[PDB]
Amino acid sequence: TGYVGLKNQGATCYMNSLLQTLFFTNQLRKAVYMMPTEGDDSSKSVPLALQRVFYELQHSDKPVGTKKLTKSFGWETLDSFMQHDVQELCRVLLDNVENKMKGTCVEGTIPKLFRGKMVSYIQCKEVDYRSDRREDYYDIQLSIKGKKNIFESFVDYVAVEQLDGDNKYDAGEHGLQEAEKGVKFLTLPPVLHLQLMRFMYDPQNIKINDRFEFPEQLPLDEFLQKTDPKDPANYILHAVLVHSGDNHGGHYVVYLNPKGDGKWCKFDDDVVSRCTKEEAIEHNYGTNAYMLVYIRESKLSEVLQAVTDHDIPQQLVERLQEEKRIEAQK
Template identity: 65%
Template sequence: MTITTTPPLDQQNLEEDTEMLVPNSDLVVEGPQPMEVHAENTNTVDAMAVEDPPAGRFTWTIDNFSRLPKKHYSDVFTVGGYKWRILIFPKGNNAEHLSMYIDVADSVTMPYGWTRFAQFSLTVVNQAHSKYSIRKENNNLELFDIAETQHQFNARESDWGFTNFMPLSELYDPSRGYVMDDRCILEADVNVRKDLDYWAHDSKKETGCVGLKNQGATCYMNSLLQTLYHIPYFRKAVYHMPTTENDMPSGSIPLALQSLFYKLQYNDSSVSTKELTKSFGWDTYDSFMQHDVQELNRVLCEKLEDKMKGTVVEGTIQQLFEGHHMNYIECMTVDYKSTRKESFYDLQLDVKGCTDVYASFDKYVEVEKLEGDNKYHAEQYGLQEAKKGVLFIDFPPVLQLQLKRFEYDFVRDTMVKINDRYEFPLQLDLDRDNGKYLSPEADRSIRNLYTLHR
């Protein structure tokens, strides 16, 4: 996540645009089990009397829910002239969550090359209080609970939905109201739309922008590159880096990035990143491996910063991304305080146990008490009880936040993704609560209000 505010860069050096936008998994199929199914189709598109409406709702009431097999389908229902069904994994699809999908019921009998486009939402009904029903939209469940998703169904992707729909602990908790008397009620709202011809879609015409091609597992890199490209000051600084006619893009990161940015700006179709990854020294195998986006960002910026030295854009990386915080240890019973100023180019924020970005910042500046066996040795005062923490002296014009979505699981001996709900506002006010994130040395006259760029 990158959050930006208007950077106070040297206008003469960069001759910047006035358009600066930003202010500072394969399981065995088991047979169907007895259940009660109630389907209701409601035309939500218009009031025309049509035999098969393009939109409808299917309600699936399941008794003996705890006795279902690990993979289970609903009865077939028809919306928009097409046959659908709900697919669930009541104990999770290799996850500690209820997994729920919309499935094309007759996919195996469809003709070669078939496609089907639909908007849909899936709901677990709360039988105690309907307002607490859970309705989901897409696989990134960080922003909204109530909305719709859309998908182009085909032979390769005949089902689509949510592996991590809701935690099993919540689903099976009788006090929550989602499973009552071993009964669960699910709903699917489907709205069939005209098929999208992706090959005929003109991204440049529709949006003014083009995308980056995925080499295999480079979506994280593409996200980073698109973010950097859409920072006008950064883009112009890249264009101003000196290169020679003897440089080859596949062997020069600056030239490869210049070429990539130029193509993103002027091409009419999606752009390949192969020249850039070759300049990293990557082979095909590397492109199919998931790399750490934070480390990639740091290495890329270091290479660019080095190339900018002695040029008109020297110091751009620092001016855009560098902030400072103060680490402190303050004794509680004697007059002694130790401080150390450090710079940062990005901030790693905890997601586990935090509901939103502000909670993550609260945890970042949380005061730790040094006491008992963990007392602080304060030079001439010896061991003392103290408090330890960090506060911010200044934030950079472009604030880069790395969300710690993975943690090490000692039982499984592997990294596990944290799928907890996490919210972030479109505007982030780091002056909130009388500047509680700021150190005494911070300039309170500078407004630390950021607009989200993601």
């Protein structure tokens, strides 16, 4: 494959999986390399740690470690990974980066890549009164219980909810009305991070293992309030984050097609291997997926830009090799 894996150094669960995904987000990798981090602390800085891991993954011929990372962002209790979830670990990661790339030539790259626009609204039935509001999203959680494929989920996500009596809406000025409450998409970011909800709550959490399908190609113009010609919302599956187990244990993996070309690889901790399209997609409908990444067709070449070794500044490169030199002593 040419690509190197991450070391299994404890119960990082999904962290490794996620990291590989961010690594193969090339415009994110480049931008991360451009962060001003010569003044930062070797073990306490998050942004420096993510540089180290990315550099290491690009150059090392030996599985890469991640202890300085987990130390940087301070998840170190016996279950701080078991009890958090991926959107969380992501946010911790991308907000430290968002904010470091600020008054920099690469400022705004995170929003550029991940931010989308929602409009959420309530609307009174009998009496006339409307409440519309814009929200920014960096990821989307989709339900699965009673859903066969992603299309159903999207149709369910934008579905209107009813606010019938006993649960009517406080129009305040206009009293208690029955109301239709819904959400609509204005825009979808270059990179779609969709999470599946396979962990529920307290009927009596439980990992749902119910069959749930998803395509290599995902068309989303129906869900946009306004399509445009000349940039449709057509999306190319890039990565499939997988887990096999229950609410007590399991094993986490990610299937990736890094160059978006449809040549897939499985990343099992320290063991990358080629694999079929079938093993990455269809074989994880339910050993099932819990998060998917899509990139917009029109954006692929700009998101998966080639990354030379010259793209790392030398001040960085010097620094890291130094840290390797010291940390080579018995």
